[PDB]
Write a protein that binds this ligand. Sequence first.
Ligand SMILES: COc1ccc(C2=NN(C3CCCCCC3)C(=O)[C@@H]3CC=CC[C@H]23)cc1C#CC(N)=O
Ligand SMILES: [Mg+2]
Ligand SMILES: [Zn+2]
Length: 333
Amino acid sequence: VTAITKVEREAVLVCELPSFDVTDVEFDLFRARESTDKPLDVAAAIAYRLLLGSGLPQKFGCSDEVLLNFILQCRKKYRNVPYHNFYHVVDVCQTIHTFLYRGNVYEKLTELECFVLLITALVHDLDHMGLNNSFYLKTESPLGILSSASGNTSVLEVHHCNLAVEILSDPESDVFDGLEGAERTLAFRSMIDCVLATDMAKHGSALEAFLASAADQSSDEAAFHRMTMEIILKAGDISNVTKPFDISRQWAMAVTEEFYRQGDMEKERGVEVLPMFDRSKNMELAKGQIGFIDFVAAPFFQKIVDACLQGMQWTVDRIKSNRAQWERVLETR
Ligand SMILES: COc1ccc(C2=NN(C3CCCCCC3)C(=O)[C@@H]3CC=CC[C@H]23)cc1C#CC(N)=O
Ligand SMILES: [Mg+2]
Ligand SMILES: [Zn+2]
């Protein structure tokens, strides 16, 4: 990777965010973006203030300047896509911080596990092109061909991991350079394992393994820590429906557009498209969000909360409240 310059660092350091609190469950990233000329500098400043405010990089030997360089090297590898961009990953990092520290999930994990989680949120979708794993496999795109020949169908998640390793190989952006021996190894393994767990083809497997390990904890403490890390990255990743309605709605507009674009691209390529990805078969946003809530997100959050993450109850309450709002949109169309 090329060196981060003094000017690039300075353009982040000048951002003031008076009147925002980045640790709060009601924090609004859209309003932070809209408040400035330079929304990419503001988003970088949010991630910087959040990580330093935690105390964790200081604990684990990561200097202020290595932390910032890492944040800016992540930023340069995100694309100009509608949803899977630098704003998504800064949102995921902020949200995980709320789960650790307002939902008290930090009680279930070591400090080192918490540091790894927050860093991993920023690398978890590096160089995403707005196309899912099925696109690559069905169209025989070159990365699809490499996946099948190679024997791993998590085409996207392996790519994100390759680029995380690339960034951390430069001493100027290695946030894990203060760790020793076995700890350094734990960090790399954890990071990678968590990123691989974000592929929605493993959603059901991940959730079963978590609920099994939570039913003991005692019998295998290490497997419970590992699964808790995976399940919290996954929860941050699909957290848009746990936010204030107007924030939730903006996220939904953006993801929906990436679905449509994939569908246009498959059609172009002679592949027959599922109707959720088809501009021609949909009108309003409401029914899609109600479906995502009923069939994926509401059961996921209620199960993790009931099994041991009791301090995360507000997520369920806000999901139910957003869903009633979409329901009203439908029945008074
Ligand atoms: C805020 O809304 C949303 C937020 C996220 C997703 C995601 N779905 N899936 C898949 C989609 C195919 C069906 C099988 C289950 C879920 C992904 O693999 C995406 C990539 C990684 C994680 C979740 C992502 C969908 C919606 C929606 C909607 C809507 N139709 O309104
Ligand atoms: Mg992903
Ligand atoms: Zn993601």
